[PDB]
Design a protein around this ligand. Structure first.
Ligand SMILES: [Zn+2]
Length: 134
RNA sequence: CUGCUCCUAGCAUGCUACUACCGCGUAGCAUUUCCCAU
């Protein structure tokens, strides 16, 4: 996985970094996950709001849907300090497990395990070419 | 790298309307020709 520096505008001097990923990983992941990703993105009115536009009243629709029958409603929001740099890998394994639960008939047990192993080997923990070294 | 949006251009399709000609089909109107031997 190649490492690179970003070029944009923000409000603090801390640097930014994108990561280039090999291409075989991309083809395999697309063929494996694309249908579920599209199904998630298209659906409206759910707990996850990925793929919903803030224009044409979508923002109001979301703000109403979250406003369900709450007896003494309040609003609370939190933050994750360094979410990506401090993620425990057990939860990442379990997350990649949840997404695969839909593959009930398309894939066998051994095939599922090998796909999970590939995902862990390619994205979770592997060799990061930074600078000119590994 | 994913999602959202704008704009432009092209294509292609579908549908609608208009114009022309054609022939058809129908209807009406009206005419023109009018025939002979082995
Ligand atoms: Zn499968």
């Amino acid at each position: 996985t190649q490492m690179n520096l970003k070029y944009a505008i923000s409000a603090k001097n801390r640097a930014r970094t994108v990561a280039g990923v090999s291409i075989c990983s991309t083809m395999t992941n697309r063929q494996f996950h694309q249908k579920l990703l599209k199904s998630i993105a298209a659906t409206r009115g759910a707990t996850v709001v990925i793929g919903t536009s803030k224009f044409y009243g979508g923002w109001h629709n979301m703000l109403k849907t979250v406003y369900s029958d709450v007896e003494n409603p309040h609003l609370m929001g939190w933050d994750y300090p360094k979410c990506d740099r401090a993620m425990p890998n057990m939860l990442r394994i379990m997350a990649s497990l949840v997404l695969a639960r839909k593959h009930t008939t398309c894939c066998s047990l051994s095939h599922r395990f090998y796909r999970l192993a590939n995902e862990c080997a390619q994205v979770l923990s592997e060799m990061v070419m930074c600078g000119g070294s590994l």
